[PDB]
Structure 1
């Protein structure tokens, strides 16, 4: 309830004119007050529409000011062009900045003038520095200047923040004012004709610098920001890659004193174990060279902080490192060219000096792993291998990007890259031919996509046809669904938390063992991911083919095999001007159904093969190896105690034993820590990388101005929890500026906190961070009922595509691969399901969402609507709340910190109740009926459809099950058992279980099975209504936790809930 005051001050500051007028609009769920709001509205518009002073009425209608709820504020203000400079000249009295063109290796990666690199606009491209966000730099500057203006009279630590950010913003505004501000077009692009006389990389530098200086709260933050902002203006290729590299060594220097553990059964369990840090001597010399590069690039204060920290190697000063490790990735992306980014990967050194003893074992281990994965389904003759074709055609992801193509649906032309639409096209013209796999050769090389991420290389993406997916689908699904019952993969270690993705950095650590951890992200072009990998899988397929007798399965397996045959020789379309290059690349990357598990397999075989060579010089027992695609760590335990020389020699042996296979590596051995791209542990404490650029994006999505405010707030929340903290007021300023909409050149509307923070399809943020909010009042109920009525909208483009011939044909062809006695129950169902993935096509989503926003605006302008009773969640919570009773409590501190970078209130909760004892309610459609259909088919009929289908007679249900391949005897047994009344109740239990509101970012981490939280929740037991008592206890926990987060103190609760309200609520439970 504070946002709106900052909104008012922002409006007053930005416009400032006599002509700038401000027009509230209100609402109330109470008839009389609502009609008085209507009145107020009318009279205000009239008075505005009559050149009368508006300031007189504002006293008379005090009632609206006290009890009504705000929606929005309108604004009539004229063009007033160029006001940014007219404000900004004062905050720019320092000296501007000069680039240094002789820093980056390439020529165009320097921050030189555009015209020196792009004389013609026809060859200009903003894609090498595109912020890719529908908000301007001028917007960012306006926000910064307003913040600076309002914080112009404070005298505290706040003033030290203001002086620091003022000096930084002076450096920035000095750099911009040297030339001026670029002006956005309607699309938020920056054309050639504005950037012609300015540096090419000024905008990204500006945005990133704003993001950094808005995240300054201390002196060391100021040092970091001044030392990165002045070098990120020139260096754009060797900065985040440089400073983020030493961290991998630093983790091997932090003594553990107190630890968190994880079980095989995936539960945290703290340990007071102490572990030293047996670091060798030569890695310090490496680290010094890295700091020498750091100083040689032009960094002075931040080497000083890393060198004076090593005098003590304490863990209390250590979050600084983590802080630094996050300050590197908030400088922007290194959006270089498709060509040179591919050539970062497409440099190869293949040699006739490697072993053969290694590759043969490698091939065999891959073979064996494949057989372990595939023994059960290949043998027991599973439907999904038999019906692999249909399985892949249902699971066609509708963003999949195979080969842009000119289509026509009746009377249109479409340039879709989506493979579902391509399949719809190819079914009609007789070209659908999944058994005949296309080649990938000179006659048909592959396109590319570009994956950028700061501090690392630009990675590449294959863009394949749609036959390869269909071939790979069934086998890879059985592989995943097997190996998540098994070690060595992220599918087994993943839900949200600690006790997961790693969960065994910290069992097998002491002064007996070590751990070798290794980044393997460059190992895609390597000589060990070519021929042996493919031939190993091919051999395994031969074994598995001889391990079955049915013929569709042999066909599917032979097609997967032939896919690996064709992918063994693979060329790559890349244009360059007029001519087209195609390069020999017979190796592995993503853009495939297979890449994750197969890379994990190959790395597993590789590390298992390497690890049988250290045994020639050491005695150890391998306790654990873990592989998640392109990373790997192995722990190993010894017959004796560890030394510095053994770690060093082991590292050299690892490096040279990879060198024997012509494989580059930075071998890293340690005792307490690891480092990988996204996270790391030091001293038995998990930190994380907070490298999510807010004001600069990777690529250009398809969302609106609106939703980008929500993504930016989500990234803010994440980065804040991770450690990187930005000023929340700035984020709110951006949200209002991005939800602002131009109805004309001079009319502009601004919504309020009570529209953006309400649970709907229009939610953007929350009134109190780290807490979703619900509604006990009339008013949230009112607007939620209103907005739920409006979420359901239409798309004429979708309507005409779904009314064409190819869509009908597609449903029919899907159908005819199965039985032919259901025509109005599933064909409509499959069409309704395909509709859920036609919306991926951007113009459909844009039509629907622009229509949705227009429907919103035609009740933001004029008064509001009651929406006719359509029930939602807050209706229920409104009835649950008035039988609670609070009392002040006092919990002690008995739980350990193991995520230091969190805010102190969240940590205080962790420091008073426990971290996660994880639970499960359903691992997907478990109840009675989908685990039969998923055994005889793959089809996934929606629970709406089942809730209807069970309500029908038992005859056409019997027909429907027989139509899905099932025999008659099991249907007869199902009807005789009388389970349909049970699966009504199980399905409605599953409907209440669909409430996903346990995992938003702060509820993600808290343990609700705690005894300390539970003794506060004194709700007596009634019985025979499990859903209600479940949700009541859950909701009471959420009340306690949210009060704790927002206020720190604790409370107890009590709900002597009447039986009458249990029953009155029971019918609204299992609806909506």
Structure 2
């Protein structure tokens, strides 16, 4: 109930005029009181529509101001959207900044004038510095200045931070006022005509610099900001990658005293094991050269910060480094050209001096792995292999974005990238032809996409036809099935929904053991991803072909084989200005259904091939090997204790043993630590990488202004947990400014606190971080029933596409490929089912969601609706509440710290209860209905549909299930078995969890099976109503925990819930109408 006050002050601050008026609107769930609210509303609207003072009535109707609930505030004020300058003249008395063109390697990557690089606007492109975000610089500056004004009178350590950031913003604003403000278009892009007389790379630096200075809480932060802001104005290609590089060595210097362990994906079990740090001499010399480059770049304070820590090499002072390690990824992207980003990868040194004894072994291991993967399904003749075509045709929605192609649905034209729609287009003209695999050559080279991530290189993406997916699908899914239980496929091992977060290193770390960890991200254009890899797979297919008797399967295999033939020679469309290059690339990269797991395989085979050479000189027991995409690590234990000389000689031998296969590497050997893209360990303590740029994005998504605020807040929460902490108030200011909407030149709308933090499809953040907030009142239910009434919408584009000819053809081919003679009973069901996966197509979502926003807007303006009894969550909590009883408790300290970078209160929680140990099927994958879905498809279906589907009669369930590609015999058998009744509870668990972000964010990190949490929750057991006792125990846990978070102390509980209300609620259970947005979730592991 505080956000809105800051909103009011922002409104008062930004406009400031007599003519600037401020117009609240309220609502209440009580009829009489609502009519008085309507009255107040009316009179206020009138007064607003008559240039009358509004401030007088506000006292008379004080009751509405105190007890009624706000929605939004409008603002009518005359201005020509400037105001930044009109405030800013005072805050700009520092010195402006001068570029240095001889910093970046290229010439055009310097921050020189646009016209000196793009004289004509017809050849201009802002994409090499496009922020790619629907939020203005003016918004950012306005937010900063209002923040600065309000935090101008606090007197504490907070003020010492304020003076620091104030000095920084002076340094910034002097530089900005030197030239001026770039002006946004409707799309928040910046055209040539504003930047025409200004430096090209001023905007991203500006935005990134704002992002940095808003994340200053300490003295060392101020040092970092002063040392980066002035150097990030020039270096834009070798900076975050640079300073973030020494960390990989630093982790190998901290003696472990106390450890954390894995068994199964979150089984934590601490260990007091001690391990020393046997560092060689030459890695220090490597580090010194890196520091010489660091100083050569213009760095003074950060060598000192790296130098004064080494006197002790203690882990208590070490988080500074970790803090620093996240500041490298909050400086921005190196948004260079597709070409030049490829040429970071497309430099090759291929030699006829490597072994042949090695590649054959490599190929064989790949072959053997393929056979291990594919022995069972190829042999037992699974339906999904026979009907691979239909399988891929269902799983088109889970594919990549194909190249743009011109379609027409009756009487329109569309440029879709969705490959299912491409197939639909090709069906009409007789072009659907999955048996004839297209070539990939001079006559038809491939387009590209770029997978970026700051502080690292750019990876590439194939953009293929629709046959390749179909070919790779079935085989790769069976491979995945094999890979669910194989440990070494780290990206693919699971307990059917999890990826192993905290590694598998710490079991056997010791004074006698070592670990070799290695980045393999440049190994895409390499000489070991060409011919042997593919031919090994082809050989494996030959073996598998001789390991089966069915003919459909052999057809599939021969087509997949020929696909691998075509992928062995593959050319690549790449523009450069106007003309187009096509380059010989007969090798492997990302952008495929096969690439990820296959790269994991290939790296596994490669390292297995490398690993047979240390054995010529050392005896070790391979305890573990791991591969996850762009890195891999193997730990090994010896017959004796380790020395410096053995590590050095092993390292040189490893480097040269990669050199024998013509393979570059920064080889890294250690005893205690690793560093990889997504996480890293030092001294038996897990840290993480906080690298998500906020004001600069990777690529241009499809979301609105609205949802990008929610994703940015989710990323904020994540980065905060990682360690990189930004001031939450700034984020809130941005959220209000991005959900604010301009209806005219002078009308602007501003939503409120109780709309963005309320459980709906529009939730954005929370009033108290790490805690969803609920509604004990009528009013949150009331507006939720309204928004649920409005969430269900239509897309006329989808309606007319489903009424076209291509849709009919598609349905006909589906039918005659599966079954016939129920042309008016199921086929309509199948059309309705295909609709469920047309909605993946983005413009449909835009139509639907913009429609949702318009419908939303026509009741944000005007008063409220009673919404007709539709039960939701807050009704339940409203009814559960009057049977509680609180009591003061006092818990002890019994859990060990292993995530220092958390806030100390979060750690206090962790230092009193446990960390999570399971991961519940948030999508119901282990459910026996889903083990059918995972048998005939990969598709998710969302928990809205499932939660509804189980509630229906036994008739339309049959139609709905048969419509999903499933045959009739197994569906009938499923209905007879009655396992869905054994799955109401799992589905409801997943439903409530998805609604309440229990497996998404801070609550994803917590053990609800704990004994420590349970002894406070003294809810006796009744039985034969599982839903109630489940939800009661859960809600009570949340109550105690929220009380703990906000107040520190603990409490116990008690709920003698009457059986009468149990029965009254049992019928209210399976008619709930609620929903949470996918875009609001914040996965700590991305």
CA deviations on 1:785-837 (whole Å, 9 max, x unpaired) are 11111111111111111111101211221222112143445433433333233
CA distance in structure 2 between the partners assigned to 1:169 and 1:426 by the alignment: 57
Shift of 1:1028: 1.6
CA deviations on 1:658-717 (whole Å, 9 max, x unpaired) are 100000000000011101111101111111111101111112222111111111111111
Deviates most, 825-834 or 519-528: 825-834
CA distance in structure 2 between the partners assigned to 1:947 and 1:728 by the alignment: 35
Shift of 1:416: 1.4
Q: Tell me if structure 2 keeps the 8 A contact 1:756–1:765.
A: yes
Partner of 1:805: 805
- Pair 1:92–1:952, CA change in 2 (3 A): closer
CA distance in structure 1 between the partners assigned to 2:209 and 2:22 by the alignment: 33
CA distance in structure 2 between the partners assigned to 1:86 and 1:463 by the alignment: 49
Shift of 1:557: 1.4
CA distance in structure 2 between the partners assigned to 1:820 and 1:1028 by the alignment: 45
CA deviations on 1:197-236 (whole Å, 9 max, x unpaired) are 1111111111111111111011000000110011000111
Secondary structure in 2 matching 1:24: strand
CA distance in structure 2 between the partners assigned to 1:922 and 1:1004 by the alignment: 11
CA distance in structure 2 between the partners assigned to 1:184 and 1:526 by the alignment: 43
- Pair 1:20–1:885, CA change in 2 (3 A): same
Deviates most, 887-896 or 571-580: 571-580
CA distance in structure 2 between the partners assigned to 1:173 and 1:495 by the alignment: 53
- Pair 1:993–1:211, CA change in 2 (3 A): closer
CA distance in structure 2 between the partners assigned to 1:842 and 1:960 by the alignment: 25
Shift of 1:489: 1.4
Partner of 1:1028: 1028
Q: Tell me if structure 2 keeps the 8 A contact 1:248–1:675.
A: yes
Partner of 2:275: 275
Shift of 1:187: 1.4
CA distance in structure 2 between the partners assigned to 1:952 and 1:782 by the alignment: 26
- Pair 1:548–1:645, CA change in 2 (3 A): same
Shift of 1:1046: 2.3
- Pair 1:999–1:891, CA change in 2 (3 A): same
Deviates most, 354-363 or 450-459: 450-459
Q: Tell me if structure 2 keeps the 8 A contact 1:519–1:630.
A: yes
Q: Tell me if structure 1 keeps the 8 A contact 2:710–2:764.
A: yes
- Pair 1:933–1:289, CA change in 2 (3 A): closer
CA distance in structure 1 between the partners assigned to 2:334 and 2:157 by the alignment: 35
Q: Tell me if structure 2 keeps the 8 A contact 1:819–1:965.
A: no
CA deviations on 1:165-220 (whole Å, 9 max, x unpaired) are 11111111111100100111111111111101111111111111111111101100
- Pair 1:177–1:937, CA change in 2 (3 A): closer
- Pair 1:584–1:983, CA change in 2 (3 A): closer
- Pair 1:937–1:665, CA change in 2 (3 A): closer
Q: Tell me if structure 1 keeps the 8 A contact 2:947–2:991.
A: no
- Pair 1:398–1:546, CA change in 2 (3 A): closer
Shift of 1:948: 9.2
Shift of 1:398: 6.6
CA distance in structure 2 between the partners assigned to 1:116 and 1:963 by the alignment: 60
- Pair 1:372–1:977, CA change in 2 (3 A): closer
CA deviations on 1:728-773 (whole Å, 9 max, x unpaired) are 1111110111000011111011000001111111111111111111
- Pair 1:928–1:672, CA change in 2 (3 A): closer
Secondary structure in 1 matching 2:74: strand
CA distance in structure 2 between the partners assigned to 1:866 and 1:956 by the alignment: 31
Secondary structure in 2 matching 1:207: helix
Q: Tell me if structure 1 keeps the 8 A contact 2:924–2:990.
A: no
Q: Tell me if structure 2 keeps the 8 A contact 1:789–1:870.
A: no
- Pair 1:946–1:172, CA change in 2 (3 A): closer
Shift of 1:931: 4.0
Q: Tell me if structure 1 keeps the 8 A contact 2:402–2:463.
A: yes
CA deviations on 1:871-926 (whole Å, 9 max, x unpaired) are 22222222222211111111111101111111111111100011122254587355
- Pair 1:16–1:934, CA change in 2 (3 A): closer
Superposition pairs for residues 783-822 of structure 1, below 5 Å? Answer: 783-822=783-822
Deviates most, 329-338 or 488-497: 488-497
Deviates most, 772-781 or 1039-1048: 1039-1048
CA deviations on 1:328-360 (whole Å, 9 max, x unpaired) are 111111100011111111111110000111111
- Pair 1:201–1:399, CA change in 2 (3 A): farther
CA distance in structure 2 between the partners assigned to 1:379 and 1:502 by the alignment: 37
Q: Tell me if structure 1 keeps the 8 A contact 2:459–2:590.
A: no
Deviates most, 772-781 or 587-596: 772-781
Q: Tell me if structure 1 keeps the 8 A contact 2:329–2:454.
A: yes
Secondary structure in 2 matching 1:807: helix
Q: Please say if 1:682 is aligned against 2:664.
A: no
Deviates most, 711-720 or 261-270: 261-270
Deviates most, 111-120 or 391-400: 391-400
- Structure 2, unaligned stretches of length 5 or more? 1073-1086
- Pair 1:478–1:824, CA change in 2 (3 A): farther
CA deviations on 1:1028-1048 (whole Å, 9 max, x unpaired) are 211211111111122222222
Shift of 1:997: 3.5
CA distance in structure 1 between the partners assigned to 2:967 and 2:709 by the alignment: 53
CA deviations on 1:406-426 (whole Å, 9 max, x unpaired) are 111111111112211110011
CA deviations on 1:363-409 (whole Å, 9 max, x unpaired) are 01111111111111111111111110000000002762222111111
Partner of 1:598: 598
CA distance in structure 2 between the partners assigned to 1:29 and 1:952 by the alignment: 31
CA distance in structure 1 between the partners assigned to 2:385 and 2:498 by the alignment: 36
CA deviations on 1:958-991 (whole Å, 9 max, x unpaired) are 9999999999998897787777876778877876
Q: Tell me if structure 1 keeps the 8 A contact 2:121–2:192.
A: yes
**Alignment TM-score, normalising by the size of structure 1:** 0.96
Deviates most, 292-301 or 897-906: 897-906
Shift of 1:432: 0.7
Q: Tell me if structure 2 keeps the 8 A contact 1:399–1:417.
A: no
- Pair 1:242–1:893, CA change in 2 (3 A): same
Shift of 1:29: 0.7
- Pair 1:909–1:467, CA change in 2 (3 A): same
- Pair 1:947–1:322, CA change in 2 (3 A): closer
Shift of 1:996: 6.2
Shift of 1:569: 0.7
Secondary structure in 2 matching 1:817: helix
Shift of 1:840: 3.5
CA distance in structure 2 between the partners assigned to 1:466 and 1:313 by the alignment: 55
Partner of 1:22: 22
CA distance in structure 2 between the partners assigned to 1:1044 and 1:987 by the alignment: 30
Shift of 1:949: 8.9
Shift of 1:497: 12
Q: Tell me if structure 2 keeps the 8 A contact 1:362–1:609.
A: yes
Q: What is the number of equivalent residue pairs in this alignment?
A: 1072
CA deviations on 1:476-500 (whole Å, 9 max, x unpaired) are 1111122111211134555899993
- Pair 1:620–1:937, CA change in 2 (3 A): closer
- Pair 1:537–1:317, CA change in 2 (3 A): same
CA distance in structure 2 between the partners assigned to 1:218 and 1:762 by the alignment: 35
- Pair 1:1020–1:74, CA change in 2 (3 A): same
- Pair 1:1006–1:594, CA change in 2 (3 A): same
CA distance in structure 2 between the partners assigned to 1:81 and 1:738 by the alignment: 15
Secondary structure in 2 matching 1:492: coil
Partner of 2:320: 320
CA distance in structure 2 between the partners assigned to 1:974 and 1:525 by the alignment: 49
Secondary structure in 2 matching 1:43: helix
Secondary structure in 2 matching 1:741: coil
Q: Tell me if structure 1 keeps the 8 A contact 2:516–2:633.
A: yes
Superposition pairs for residues 659-808 of structure 1, below 5 Å? Answer: 659-808=659-808
CA distance in structure 2 between the partners assigned to 1:717 and 1:359 by the alignment: 47
- Pair 1:877–1:344, CA change in 2 (3 A): same
Q: Tell me if structure 1 keeps the 8 A contact 2:115–2:197.
A: yes
Deviates most, 933-942 or 102-111: 933-942
Q: Tell me if structure 2 keeps the 8 A contact 1:94–1:171.
A: yes
- Pair 1:975–1:648, CA change in 2 (3 A): closer
- Pair 1:535–1:139, CA change in 2 (3 A): same
Q: Tell me if structure 1 keeps the 8 A contact 2:266–2:501.
A: no
Secondary structure in 2 matching 1:969: helix
Q: Please say if 1:473 is aligned against 2:451.
A: no
- Pair 1:618–1:16, CA change in 2 (3 A): same
**Alignment TM-score, normalising by the size of structure 2:** 0.95
